[PDB]
Amino acid sequence: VSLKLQKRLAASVLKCGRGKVWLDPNEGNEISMANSRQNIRKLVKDGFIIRKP
Amino acid sequence: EVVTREYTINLHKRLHSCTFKKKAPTAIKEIRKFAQKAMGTKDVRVDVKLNKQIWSRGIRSVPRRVRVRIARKRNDDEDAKEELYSLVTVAEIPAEGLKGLGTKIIED
Amino acid sequence: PSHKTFMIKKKLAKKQRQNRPIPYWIRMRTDNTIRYNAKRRHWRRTKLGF
């Protein structure tokens, strides 16, 4: 699957560059299941999407 | 069979006069061919940590000698063409160093 | 551009509506000769020249 949309939305939500977005490689299916900024925020809260330092 | 060994690989002589921009990828290919020759397995998988070690000093400064562990395992996947595959990982360097270190058998 | 006149915008709307394939049921009409939309336009191939 492709997570380009998730990467873009995570970058926008975290207010960081796309190169500072970390998508958990072991949570690919559940990350791809998200298609809205609300789902992205929920994933960030759960810890599957992290802003890198 | 399932056998694990530890080898010392002389990458210096294998990559003598290698073009700078291809030196580390050539080292990766060199290690793959070394594992193929040593274990008889076409399919060789290089550990991410070993790749990190090879690339740790850039694309030019490949280490002269590298201590690796090669393990031959049976491929569980049925759709795999090869029955066995080789896994190459880093190996611990003794305190005395690489001097006097030969090929060793790891499996108990 | 972002700044555009109302007339130009309406003309572009008409061009967008006209840029589409023909309905499938057109090909089944008795004594039909239309095979496809011969006037299809792509924004990169032919410019409108407005």
Binding site: - | - | M7, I8, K11, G49, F50
Partner: protein
């Protein structure tokens, strides 16, 4: 530099759509159409271009009103009447 480099500078429209004939022939600075000579009252037409004349002559359009004239002439422009009730 008079070729490819020069072609890179094209973003000022000499002509825009003409109000009357709809062509992209309305010279903005001259404020006049090079195709139909709008806003001049008379249409621009010349005998040395028969093709140009036949591209825009009467009949190439809709003839909203003119198309119905022959029927009215055939009826003698009968008006203010209807067929006998059934």
């Amino acid at each position: 530099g008079k070729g490819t480099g020069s072609f890179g500078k094209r973003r000022n429209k000499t002509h825009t759509l003409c109000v009357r004939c709809g062509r992209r022939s309305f010279h903005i600075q001259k404020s006049r159409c090079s195709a139909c000579a709008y806003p001049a009252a008379r249409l621009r037409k010349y005998n040395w271009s028969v093709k140009a004349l036949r591209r825009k002559t009467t009949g190439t359009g809709r003839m909203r009103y003119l198309r119905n004239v022959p029927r009215r002439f055939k009826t003698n422009f009968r008006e203010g009447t209807e067929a006998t009730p059934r």
